[PDB]
Every structure is written in C-alpha cells, then in structure tokens.
RNA sequence: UAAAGCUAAAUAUAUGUAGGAGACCGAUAGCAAACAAGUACCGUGAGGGAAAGAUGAAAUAGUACUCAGGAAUGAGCAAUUAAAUAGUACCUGAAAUCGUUAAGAUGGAACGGAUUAAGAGAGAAAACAAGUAAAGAGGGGAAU
RNA sequence: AUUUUAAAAUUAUUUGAAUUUUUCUUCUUAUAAUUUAAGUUGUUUCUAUACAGUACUUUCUUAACCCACUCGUCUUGAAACACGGACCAAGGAGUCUAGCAAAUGUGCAAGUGUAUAUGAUUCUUUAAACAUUUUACGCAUAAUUAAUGUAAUAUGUCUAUUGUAGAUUUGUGCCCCACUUUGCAUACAAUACCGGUAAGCAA
RNA sequence: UUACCGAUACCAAGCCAUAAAAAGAAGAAAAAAUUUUUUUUUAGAAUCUUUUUAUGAGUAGAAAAUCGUGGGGU
C-alpha cells in the first residue's frame, strides 16, 4: 500500500475530445491539433482547445463588440471561435478582417459591404499558421440567462440570482421574504 | 436545371423557396492535408521530435 | 463546373448543363442522420 | 399499458429539414459516397449524371 | 470547395457497404473496395478515398485490372505493361497480388 | 495456472463459474457478479469461487489469435475470402455453421488454392 | 430512447439505485407543494423567497389589450430601415427619414442608446420617453405623436 | 333591446355495422374467449367465470396381413409414407423427476476453491518435411 | 527504414603527456575491430525420418495436500436458535404523458418557432413528404412599481463608462527570457443611468 | 545470543487495465536453394499508432465502455 492522493493518478478536468460528430468540425479539430502540436504556438493551442468547447462556451460576438475590440488594431485580423451576429444598434462598420466559425447572413453581408472579409479556420490556418497579426477574441460567456439563476440561491442575503417562476407579476414570489412588510426581505 | 431555380439562383415567384439561403460551410476547403502540405505552414512547423 | 446530359440511348452525349449550386452544400452525415431519425417517426401508426 | 398518447411524431425544424435535403443532394453528387451507400456504379460515366 | 479526400474518409470510415467486421475473431476489420489493393479500412488504402489507385480483382472468374470519372477495368506480362502504362513498392505489391489471384480457379 | 505455448500466454484456464451454480439447478454456471450483502465471493473470502478481473487479460500482442498463431475469420461465401488473399499467413478461415455442403466444398477449394487454412475443414462429409 | 435510460444500467443491482436503507417509497414527504412552511420551508425560503402572502390590489378583469405597448429604444431606429437608405440619408443632409414605428409594431419609443450625431430623424409613435424625445431633438430630429 | 319560438355547416363519437391499415401481440401473449366462450362450471341470488390451437403434401395414404393373447395390447420375415422415435395424447420436444446400460466413488452430509496426479473420451487448425522427377485423375488462363 | 546511434569498456596498432613507476597505470591522436555497450544467444539431442497411439493438446471422472458455514435481506452486527426459499420451466417490476430546469448535440440568430389552417396533375406507400401575394400568436428583444404609471451615459462623439489583474497581438533586446503595444473572457471594485422608497425643495 | 520459518505487505522482472506523458498525417530486411529462384513480411485506422512511468479494496451511490433479446430502415 502507498499513501497517495487519488491513488496516484493525475486527474484532469474538462473536455478531452470533440463531442460533435460534424465532419467538417472534426477535420478542423484534427488540423488545429496538428498545428498546436507541431508549432509551439499558444495561439494554435488555444484555438484547438476552444474548438472543442460546448456551445455555451463559444458564445456569439456582435459586430459592434468585434469592431470595438479591433478598434486599436486596424491592420490585424480578429479570430473568434464562436459566431458573429449582426448588431442593428451599430450605425456603420469599417473594414474588418475576421475569422470565425460561422457568420450570420446579415453580419456576413454587412462585413462584405464594409469591405472587410469573413474567413474560416482552414483559411486562417493556411494564411496565418502561427497567428501573426491575429487577435483572439471571445464573446460574453457569462451573459446567458442560465447564469442569471446561478451562484448564491435566491433567498440568500444579497443574492442576485433570478428565481424560477412561471410569471413575474405582483402575485408571483413577491410577498414574504422579498419585502420588509412581510416577515423579512431577501 | 430547375434545381437552381428552386434553391435561389434565377428565382421565380411560385418555384423558388421564399427567402431561403443555402447552408454555408464551416470550412472553406476541407482538404486539410493540402493546407498542411502547403509551404506556408510547412515553414511554420517545428522540427520533428522523438518519443520515449 | 458542368455535367454532361446523356440521351436515353446511352452511347451519345447531348448539350451540357452547369451543376446547380445546391450540390456545394456541406454533406453533413450527422445532420442528415438526426433529421432522418426525427422525420421517419412521423409516419408511424399508433398501437 | 401502452397508450395511444405516446409521442408518435416529431416536430422537425424547417431549416434543418431543408439543410438535410440539400446535404443529401450534395452527397448524391459525389461518386465515392454513392459507391459507399451500395450502388454498383463502377460503369457509369459520372455520378451527377443527367439525361435528356 | 465542398468535398475532399479527408472529408470522404470522415464520412465513410464507419458507415460503408464494403466494411466487413470480424465479429468472431474480434480483431479484424476489412474494407472490400473495388480499388482496395490491400483490404485495410484505412484512408491511405481506401479505394473511394484515394484520388488515384490501381488494383486487380477477380470478377466472374476473370482477373481484371482496375484503375481510378477514371474507371477502366481491363482484363502477367500484360499486367506488368498495364501497370507501367497506368502507373502513378505499390507496383510490386500489385504484381504479387495478381500472381496470387492467378492461382484461383 | 498459466499455460504457455510459444509466444502465447493464457493467464488462466477453467473459466469462472457463477457462485453456488454447482448446487442449484436454477442457477446457471454463466458468470454473474454477486451483488449480495454478505456474499463470501463478493467479499473475496478464502477458498471460494474467485471473481474475474482485468488482471487476467491476455497480452494484446497475442490476444485473439488461435493455437495456430492466426486470427480466425468466419466466412459464409466464396466472395468473403478476397480480404484473405492478402492476409493468408495471419488469418485462418472458419466456415459458418449454416453453410450447405455445396458452398462448403467451394469454400474449401478456394481456401486451399488461396493456401489459407480452414479450421472446420471436414465438417459435413 | 429507452435503451439509453439510466435504469437499464442498474438491471441487476437489487435496489435500482434508490438506496438499500432509505428505499424508494411513495411520496415520503407529501404530495406536490405539501410541506411549505412546515418541513419544506428551507427549500421554499432558499429557492422561492417571496412565495407566501399577498401584495397589492386586485384588478378584477384585466383586458390586456388596453395596456399592450411594445417598446423600441432609440438605438434601433436607424437599424429599422435598410442599409442602402441609411447610407443615402446619412449622405444627404437636406433630408431626413420619418419612421412610423407603429407600422413596425412598436407603441412607445424608449431612450436607451446613442443616436448618430448630427443626423436628423423624425419619429412617429404613440408614446415617447422623455429621454427618447430629448435625444431625438438633440440629434436635430422631431417626435410626432400619432394614434 | 329580457321575460315567446325555429334554424344547416364547421364539432363529438370506449356503441352497432362495414371497409382499410400498423416499427402492435404471437396461444401463461393478444379481448375473458384464435376452439362448441360469456361456453363448461360455482353461488339461493345480485353475480363469479375458466381451461382448451399445430399428424401429414396427400388420410381420395389414419395403419392392411401373420403370430401370441379372453381382451387390451405386443412382435414380425408383414405394411402407408420422404419420414411412424410423424400413429390421432400425433410439428419441434427443454428442465424438474424417473428407468436401462456402462464407468467410478462410498468410516456421522454433499458440492466447491487452488494445485497436480491417475484414468477415460475426444483431437491435428502451430503441435516436422517446403520443394524436385515420373505416372493417373482432373480443373483453369494465355496464346491463332 | 534515418540515435541498438553517440559515447563506455576491451583488444591490436599509433601520438604526446602525466604518474601513484606499470604484463588490467591513467589521460588523448588516429585507425580497425569486438562487447563488459546497445533487455539471450549458441551447440547437440529428442519429438521424428508420424499423420493420431500408450506420445503430445484438451475435456471429463476420480482421488490426494491445503482451504472452504446458506444464499437473498433488514441491520452496528447473520452461518445464525432472524425472516423468504422443496424442485424446474415460462411470466415477473423506475415506464408513459404533461410541465420546468440543467447538460450536451443541431439549425438559425435580435430574432426564432410557420400554430390552427390553407395549396398541390402528391393521394399503395402518402396518417408523410413539399409549400405559405411584402405587422396571427408564443418565447426572447427592458426593467421596476400595489398602483395612476414611468422606463436605462447623452449629442459633446460612428470616441462604444473607469480602474487592478488577465488571453491574444505589436516591436527591442523564425525558435528561450525582460521591457514596450493591445487589453478577449472573467474576477474584484468604482462610476454613471432606469423603476420604487426615503430625505430636501416643491407652481 | 544466533539461525530459521512465516502475508494478497516490501523488492526485481513479465503481463492486463486505469491515469498521465514523449511523439507521430514512406524505405527493403532476412533466410534457404542455385549470378537465378523460393519463403515470410515491406505498417500509417488521430477515441488511431509506437514508446514511457506511476497506479489498481470497496457497500449505498454515480459514470463509461462493452454483451445479449423482440421489431424497423439501410
């Protein structure tokens, strides 16, 4: 017998393999795993890791946020492992070179009209194998509604978690425990 | 010939699928081994290392 | 990108036709399989 | 006991159905895939074959 | 474009009318392509994955020579000259496969 | 006890039998893991029906191959020997149980002229 | 789908994963929302704080059609109209678009977001936010009340 | 515009009848009932309520004849059938349980684990001999 | 099939030096080899000059040495003088629907789902497939208040709040590191602004 | 005071699996006969291949990979 943590086996956490059986995504994962192995590039390693992530961890990036993040590098290209969505709040776009998994039709048309272009990750590997002049970006991973219910339970003091309710009227979870007039608040 | 009309090229009123756009691929060209054998990434690859 | 049109008599070739752009969509065997498993469920008769 | 109110059918997204049909046409357009599916096409001239 | 050798391998590595598993002796998996010289289920040997390939196969009691659009199906010296005329180690493997097929009734 | 024939090591023979299957006819000898609460075999008491474990697994270099140092392949057709034309030295052939005498004779002929060995060569004659 | 069920993998495990001591009985805590305020009170207070009690006055019959009022913020007014016409309106300073948001399906215009500087725009709506109107006329536009 | 009245359609149909179907069940299942089934049978009564399908292609092939028996049956050198160890309980014919023969063990349990030894059954697919010459039977392919 | 290589050692020559002063002294200069390197190789027999036996492989049956309590279950604790089980066959138990959420896959994306229904030379299959003359509806896109209601920097500016860390990028000392450049996600705070409530003022 | 016997513990080696790691998307080797033949092989499946190290009890409970059955499409 030996006194070892976890009986002596190193335990990793998170994804180990691609779950999606999408042949194109599998080819892309193969290519970028090879790139990350054969080059020293943390850029390629990060892209290979992110291509594996679940849907909730490759969130969409809006055009406005893309342009805002790319504002200070007009000559480099922006690499997003999620999707690029159009933003109607943005008035004008300006010449963006962006590689991404997928582009919504409106975002694609807007980028092309602005004169930049949309790239796939195979083209990104072909033209920038080590990520020169390439800025890795990701959308808000914690902005989704599911996260609003997480953390401290709604009912703990100073908790910002939304409760699970059928509706949010005056007569749905608003009386005792949410105001001083009925027992306590929060 | 009617396939193009149905799926968006040279559309007509009662034939083309209204407001339908053909799906777009995740990859531009799936010949990943051609891109790997391209000289641009061949130059970027480090020297082959050895196993245990 | 064109395809030859053949007469019903197979020994002759008549005017060619440009291949429609729908032949360039991703092949997506997984998507086809999942959609098929969902779709083939709709013709079932109850028991 | 088996009941008639089992979920017999399924609602499939129209976009996904159209994607599947387009992909099936594209797959029928490539020679290797037809051979793999099991059609004896070793003697036809081209797999996207069209006739008058 | 839309298709590639790697993509075809992705589609056909599992679902295939030519794949024969070895259910009883668990370790064998064969691919019986018309253009598979050695019957490995491997993208470097798969007939429908390779762009160009040649092999010999007995068909209806006749050994035929097949070359891979691009499908020829011709009928030892003749085999050598056909291989040299349609050639793109593999040649020697093909020759020995033909010499083994020639002993079949 | 292990038996060693050439490069082949069979780490254990005399296949595991289900606990108490020797003295109950309704309990078949096919192995079942005793779930139990106080089950002797589950607790690994001395001298009773040891349980199978992954430690008994065979060397994977010689795992599935027969005493003739070949992997067996079961065929039901003459057309199912084409893969064996390129593997005649490390595959032996076995004819499927439900193949008639005519097809059996054809398969034996093809295997011999393919110099592939047949396991059940003299069946149904 | 029945062959992917978790109960299948406990086929020969006696208790079916429900415990050897506690067992799987029939409603051991009550039915539905039975124990609120008594023995499910911790769950109710931890996950559904304001559940018990009543607050506010009754509205005897509602008729939601009376108060139905979709809203749009000022930062989407320019995006309502197509890109080419947006370019034309921004290029030509002698004319401005007047947009009837009611036709698009909005009754009230709210004031969140930033309008383009020095780009006049006229908006027709049933209701306006104070800040929305302030921004509209700050960029040189006008708010028009319609019904 | 109450205290009078009529009115088709779109709607529903665990009933009856008649059609058509199924990723349904396949005789302990499926209706209780595949059959002479709401039958037999039970209860004073209200009611309760089963079990039970399959020889064979053809019985327009359902066992002729002989011997022995009072008979049932049995046997045959006799007989239908492709087949009677398909003989009406008849397709197949498992287990429990029992019989015959053989082999073995046997001092108040029997079985078993692990290791061998002695016997008794089976066995050649690694558990030797590729090739070479002759004659005998064959099969193919190429060559005009 | 491009580290069983390199070296290390040893042998036989050879160069110079050192030294414990030498037939295993050491250190290199070159060459050629060998293994003590760089995880077992060789010889001789036998099987056997057989085609299945008295041998070899294997199954079974018996012994023999050592060990071995009745399984399932409740239980702190079962071999229990705790309960169920005489035997065998067949049947026999986390399922279906509604609704919610999480997880993951898929499609599209500030939209998404074409509901009921319609049409169509589709009408064995087909009760499925296909389709929908340029604000139906659900959910989402905005919150807050019992509520009349009110409703998110704010026109100096197509800059898009501020810090501390932080991925990626940029150069200087195409591959190590410290300065520069940019500053994703996120975390911790700060700020504004919206709804409600206080407080001050209040035509 | 010695020697010895004595574990599923310890040590060396082999093998199975688990975990982690190093790395990876094309060319002739040998033997037997007599320059010519013969016999084997001559590999490249990324949840894959090669190699390396450590580790392995388990009720209640959880998960993965496998093995079977009726029926459907291919």
Q: Which chains touch B (3 or more CB pairs under 8 A)?
A: A, C, D, E
Strand partners, A134: A77
- Of F115, F62, F125, F59, which Cα lies nearest the Cα of F92? F115
Q: How many CB atoms lie within 10 A of CB E68?
A: 22
**Smallest CA–C1' distance to I104, residue:** A54
Q: Does A121 contact B27 at a Cβ distance shorter than 8 Å?
A: yes
Residue of A nearest to B38 (CA): A126
Q: Is the dihedral of CA G36, G37, G42, G47 positive or negative?
A: positive
Distances (CA, A) of F98 to F81, F95, F102, F118, G86: 17, 8, 12, 16, 77
Cα distance between residue C36 and residue D17, in whole Å: 9
Query: How were these coordinates obtained?
Result: cryo-EM
Query: Are A185 and A177 spatial neighbours (Cβ–Cβ below 8 Å)?
Result: yes
A123: left (phi > 0), else alpha (psi -120 to 50), else beta?
Answer: alpha
Strand partners, A97: A117
Q: A120-134: buried (b, 16+ CB within 10 Å) or exposed (e) per residue?
A: bbbbbbbbbbbbeeb
> Which residue has tokens 């749009």?
G72
SS3 A120: coil
Q: Which chains touch A (3 or more CB pairs under 8 A)?
A: B, C, E, G
Distances (CA, A) of B50 to A41, D3, F87: 19, 63, 32
Cα distance between residue A63 and residue A53, in whole Å: 22
Q: Are strands E54-59 and A61-62 parallel, antiparallel or unpaired?
A: unpaired
Q: How far is C33 from chain D (nearest CA, A)?
A: 9
SS3 A77: strand
Distances (CA, A) of A171 to A155, A157, A158, G32: 17, 22, 22, 20
Q: A66-96: buried (b, 16+ CB within 10 Å) or exposed (e) per residue?
A: bbeebeeeeeebbbbbbbbbbbebbbebeeb
Which of E12, E15, E73 lies at the smallest CB-CB distance from D32? E12
> Which residue has tokens 């474009």?
E1
Distances (CA, A) of D36 to D27, E12, E20: 11, 7, 13
- Of A60, A108, A99, which Cα lies nearest the Cα of A79? A99
What DSSP assignment string belongs to A138-149? Answer: ---TT-SGGGGG
Query: Are C32 and D24 spatial neighbours (Cβ–Cβ below 8 Å)?
Result: yes
In D, which residues are within 8 Å of B23 by CB distance?
Answer: 19, 22-23
Q: Which resolution in angstroms does this entry have?
A: 2.3
* Rg (alpha carbons) of chain F, rounded to whole number: 20
Cα distance between residue G92 and residue F55, in whole Å: 83
Q: How many CB atoms lie within 10 A of CB F73?
A: 24
Tell me how far the alpha carbon of residue G66 is from its chain's centroid.
19
Cα distance between residue G85 and residue G79, in whole Å: 10
B33 interface with E at CB cutoff 8 Å? yes
B23 interface with C at CB cutoff 8 Å? yes
Tell me how far the alpha carbon of residue A170 is from its chain's centroid.
36
DSSP annotation of F84 reads: G
Number of H helices, E strands in chain F: 1, 4
SS3 G131: helix
Distances (CA, A) of B35 to A129, B42, B44, D45, E10: 10, 9, 12, 30, 17
Residue E39 sits at the vertex; the CA angle it makes with E38 and E40, to the nearest 5 degrees, is 95
Number of H helices, E strands in chain C: 1, 2
Which of B21, B25, B46 lies at the smallest CB-CB distance from A38? B46
> Which residue has tokens 């499908």?
E71
Count of CA atoms in the C-beta half-sphere (13 A) of A45? 6
Tell me how far the alpha carbon of residue D4 is from its chain's centroid.
30
Query: Are E54 and E67 spatial neighbours (Cβ–Cβ below 8 Å)?
Result: yes
Sheet hosting strand G108-110, strand order edge to edge: G71-73, G108-110, G127-128
- Of F12, F49, F45, F13, which Cα lies nearest the Cα of F33? F49
Q: Are strands G108-110 and G127-128 parallel, antiparallel or unpaired?
A: parallel
Residue of E nearest to C3 (CA): E69
C1 interface with B at CB cutoff 8 Å? no
Cα distance between residue D2 and residue C41, in whole Å: 17
Dihedral angle over CA of G44, G49, G51, G57, nearest 10? 170
What DSSP assignment string belongs to F5-42? Answer: ETTEEES--S----TTGGG-TTS-SS------SS-TTT
* Rg (alpha carbons) of chain B, rounded to whole number: 22
Cα distance between residue B29 and residue A17, in whole Å: 23
Task: Spell out the residues 6+ positions from residue E72 whose beta carbon is closer than 8 angstroms to its own.
Answer: E65, E66, E86
Query: Are A101 and A126 spatial neighbours (Cβ–Cβ below 8 Å)?
Result: no
Q: How many CB atoms lie within 10 A of CB E101?
A: 17
Query: Are A138 and A80 spatial neighbours (Cβ–Cβ below 8 Å)?
Result: yes
Encoding tokens for residue F20?
């108490």
Query: Are D34 and E12 spatial neighbours (Cβ–Cβ below 8 Å)?
Result: no
The secondary structure element, H or E, covering residue C16 is strand C13-18
State the alpha helices, DSSP H only, in chain G: 41-47, 77-80, 83-91, 101-104, 130-138
Task: Spell out the residues 6+ positions from residue G131 whose beta carbon is closer than 8 angstroms to its own.
Answer: G110, G111
Query: Are F111 and F117 spatial neighbours (Cβ–Cβ below 8 Å)?
Result: yes
In A, which residues are within 8 Å of G76 by CB distance?
Answer: 88-89
Q: Are strands A77-85 and A117-119 parallel, antiparallel or unpaired?
A: unpaired
Residues of A with CB under 8 A from a CB of E: 23-24, 26-27, 30
10 Å CB burial of residue B52 (0-12, 13-18, 19+) is exposed
Query: Are F83 and E32 spatial neighbours (Cβ–Cβ below 8 Å)?
Result: yes
Encoding tokens for residue B48?
């082959």
Query: Are A30 and A48 spatial neighbours (Cβ–Cβ below 8 Å)?
Result: no
Q: Does G46 contact A170 at a Cβ distance shorter than 8 Å?
A: no
Query: Are G71 and G110 spatial neighbours (Cβ–Cβ below 8 Å)?
Result: yes
The secondary structure element, H or E, covering residue D36 is helix D31-37
Dihedral angle over CA of A72, A78, A83, A88, nearest 10? 30
The yes-or-no reply on B/G contact (3 CB pairs or more, < 8 Å) is no
Beta-strand ranges (E) seen in A37-104 are 61-62, 77-85, 97-103
For residue G18, say whether its CB is under 7 Å from any atom of strand I: yes
Task: Spell out the residues 6+ positions from residue A18 whose beta carbon is closer than 8 angstroms to its own.
Answer: A25, A26, A29, A51, A52
Strand partners, A102: A83
Q: Does F83 contact E39 at a Cβ distance shorter than 8 Å?
A: yes
> Which residue has tokens 């149905």?
B6
3-state secondary structure chain E: CCCCHHHHHHHHCCCCCCEEECCCCCCCEEECCCCCCCCECCCCCCCCCCCCCEEEEEECCEEEEEECCCCCCECCHHHHHHHHHCCCCHHHHHHHHHHHHCCCC
Q: How many residues make up chain C in this entry? A: 47
Encoding tokens for residue F81?
């020997």
Q: What are the φ/ψ torsions at residue E53 (nearest 5 degrees)? A: -155, 160
**Interface mutation vs chain C, best among D11, D24, D31, most C CBs within 10 Å:** D24
Q: How many CB atoms lie within 10 A of CB F47?
A: 6
> Which residue has tokens 């060209």?
B29
Distances (CA, A) of A61 to A112, A117, A131, G114: 17, 16, 20, 20
Cα distance between residue G143 and residue G138, in whole Å: 11
> Which residue has tokens 């069209």?
D50
F32 interface with G at CB cutoff 8 Å? yes
Query: Are F18 and F31 spatial neighbours (Cβ–Cβ below 8 Å)?
Result: yes
Q: Is the dihedral of CA B14, B15, B17, B19 positive or negative?
A: negative
Task: Spell out the residues 6+ positions from residue A111 whose beta carbon is closer than 8 angstroms to its own.
Answer: A63, A84, A93, A96, A98, A103, A117, A118
Q: Which chains touch D (3 or more CB pairs under 8 A)?
A: B, C, E
Encoding tokens for residue E81?
């000259």
The secondary structure element, H or E, covering residue F103 is helix F101-113
Tell me how far the alpha carbon of residue C40 is from its chain's centroid.
18
> Which residue has tokens 């069946």?
F123
Residue F68 sits at the vertex; the CA angle it makes with F67 and F72, to the nearest 5 degrees, is 90
Q: A138-162: buried (b, 16+ CB within 10 Å) or exposed (e) per residue?
A: bbeeeeeeeeeeeeebbbeeeeebe
* Rg (alpha carbons) of chain D, rounded to whole number: 18
């Amino acid at each position: 017998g030996i006194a070892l943590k976890n009986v002596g086996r190193i335990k990793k956490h998170g994804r180990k393999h691609l779950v999606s059986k999408n042949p194109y995504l599998r080819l892309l994962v193969k290519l970028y795993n090879f790139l990350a192995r054969r080059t020293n590039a943390n850029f390629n390693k990060i892209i290979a890791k992110r291509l594996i992530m679940p849907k909730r961890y490759r969130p969409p990036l809006s055009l406005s946020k893309l342009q805002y993040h790319m504002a200070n590098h007009p000559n480099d290209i922006a690499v997003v492992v999620g999707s690029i969505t159009d933003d109607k709040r943005l008035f004008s776009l300006k010449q963006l070179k962006v590689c991404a998994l997928r582009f919504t039709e409106t975002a694609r048309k807007r980028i092309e009209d602005a004169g930049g272009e949309c790239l796939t990750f195979d083209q990104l590997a072909l033209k920038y194998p080590t990520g020169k002049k390439c800025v890795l970006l990701r959308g808000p991973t914690k902005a989704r509604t599911a996260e609003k219910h997480f953390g401290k339970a709604p009912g703990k003091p100073k908790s910002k978690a939304r409760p699970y309710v059928r509706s949010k009227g005056r007569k749905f979870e608003k009386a005792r425990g949410r105001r001083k007039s009925r027992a306590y608040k929060k | 010939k009617k396939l193009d009309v149905i799926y968006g090229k040279i559309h007509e009123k009662k034939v083309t699928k209204k407001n339908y756009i053909l799906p777009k691929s995740i990859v531009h060209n799936p010949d990943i081994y051609r891109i790997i054998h391209s000289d641009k990434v061949q130059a970027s690859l480090l020297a082959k290392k050895k196993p245990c | 990108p064109v395809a030859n049109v053949y007469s019903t008599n197979g020994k002759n070739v008549v005017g060619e036709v440009e291949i429609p752009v729908v032949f360039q969509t991703p092949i997506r065997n997984d998507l086809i399989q999942s959609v098929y498993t969902n779709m083939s469920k709709n013709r079932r008769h109850p028991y | 006991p088996t009941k008639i109110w089992r979920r017999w059918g399924r609602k499939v997204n129209l976009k996904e159905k159209r994607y599947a049909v387009c992909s099936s046409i594209a797959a029928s357009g490539v020679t290797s895939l037809v051979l793999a599916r099991g059609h004896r096409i070793s003697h036809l001239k081209e797999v996207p074959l069209v006739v008058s | 474009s839309n298709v590639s050798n790697a993509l075809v391998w992705e589609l056909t590595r599992k679902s295939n009318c030519f794949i024969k598993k070895n259910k009883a002796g668990k370790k064998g998996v064969f691919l019986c392509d018309p253009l598979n010289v050695n019957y490995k289920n491997t993208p470097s040997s798969s007939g429908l994955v390779k762009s160009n390939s040649t092999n010999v196969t007995l068909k209806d009691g006749k050994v035929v020579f097949s070359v891979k659009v691009v499908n020829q199906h011709f009928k030892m010296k003749n085999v050598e000259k056909l291989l040299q005329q349609h050639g793109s180690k593999n040649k020697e493997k093909l020759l020995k496969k033909y010499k083994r097929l020639s002993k079949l009734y | 006890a292990v038996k060693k024939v050439g490069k082949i090591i069979k780490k254990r023979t005399k296949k595991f039998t289900r606990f108490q299957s020797n003295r109950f006819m309704r309990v078949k000898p096919a192995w079942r893991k005793p779930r139990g609460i106080d089950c002797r075999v589950r607790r690994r008491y001395k001298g009773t029906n040891l349980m199978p474990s992954i430690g008994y697994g065979s060397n994977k270099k010689t795992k599935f191959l027969l005493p003739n140092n070949k992997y067996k392949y079961v065929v039901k057709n003459v057309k199912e020997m084409e893969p064996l034309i390129m593997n005649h030295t490390k595959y032996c052939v076995q004819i499927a149980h439900n193949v008639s005498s005519k097809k059996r004779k054809q398969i034996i002929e093809r295997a011999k002229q393919m110099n592939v060995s047949v396991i059940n060569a003299k069946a149904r004659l | 789908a029945t062959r992917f069920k978790k109960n299948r993998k406990k086929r020969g495990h006696v208790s079916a994963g429900h415990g050897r001591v506690g067992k799987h009985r029939k409603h051991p805590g009550g039915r539905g929302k039975a124990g609120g305020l008594h023995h499910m009170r911790i769950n109710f207070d931890k996950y559904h704080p304001g559940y018990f009690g009543k607050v506010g006055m009754r509205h005897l019959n509602l008729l939601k059609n009376r108060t139905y009022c979709p809203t749009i913020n000022v930062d989407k007014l320019w995006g309502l109209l197509p890109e080419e016409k947006k370019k034309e309106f921004s290029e030509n300073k002698d004319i401005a678009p007047v947009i009837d948001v009611t036709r698009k399906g909005y009754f009230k215009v709210l004031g969140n977001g930033k309008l383009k500087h020095n780009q006049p725009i006229v908006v027709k709506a049933r209701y306006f936010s104070s800040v929305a109107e302030k921004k509209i006329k700050a960029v040189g536009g006008q708010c028009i009340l319609v019904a």
